[PDB]
Structures are given as structure tokens and as C-alpha cells.
């Protein structure tokens, strides 16, 4: 309501390139040739969810 913003999720355009996320943010490869990955900024960021 206030901020008119939305929060992105952990997401990627390759399944192969998504697995690199679940290790943690550090090892994620944000880009490959075209295929890429998006890592979430949420209030849920640090929870088990």
C-alpha cells in the first residue's frame, strides 16, 4: 500500500542454473549466455520459506 513495490523471488531461466542458487546466494551464477537468475529481496528473505 505504501511503497507501490513488489518483491522478486528466487528465479532463473534454467533449471540447471537454478540449482546453483539453493547452495546459497554466494555461489549462484547470475548469468550464463542468455539464461540468467534472479535472487529474491523479500521480507521473507532469511526465513525457511
Amino acid at each position: 500500500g505504501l511503497f507501490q513495490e513488489a518483491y522478486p523471488i528466487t528465479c532463473a531461466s534454467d533449471p540447471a542454473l537454478l540449482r546453483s542458487a539453493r547452495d546459497g546466494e554466494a555461489h549462484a551464477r547470475e548469468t550464463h549466455f542468455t539464461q540468467y537468475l534472479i535472487y529474491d529481496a523479500s521480507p521473507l528473505k532469511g526465513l525457511s520459506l
Binding site: I9, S13, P43
Partner: protein, 49 residues
Amino acid sequence: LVGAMDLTFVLPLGLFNPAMERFAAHAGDLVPAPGHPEPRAFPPRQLFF
């Protein structure tokens, strides 16, 4: 005293990496089987999450 949340999440589908940003962190990072077309290079039409 048990509440609720509403969070809205933004997922892009068909976007395309900029010029500087199309690369691979190494030469052989994800290599398709020898003599096969590499989908990693194509424009992504999908997502995963």
C-alpha cells in the same frame, strides 16, 4: 493476535541479457553433449522457481 500478510511477487519471463552481460563464467561451465545444439545460447522463453 494471529495476523496475515499480502506480498506481491514480480517474475519476468521473456527478457534478454544486455551486451556486457552475455557471457559464461568459464569456458566449459555447462557444455552440451559433443556435437549437439546448445539451448543455453537461445533466448529464454520460460522460468523456473
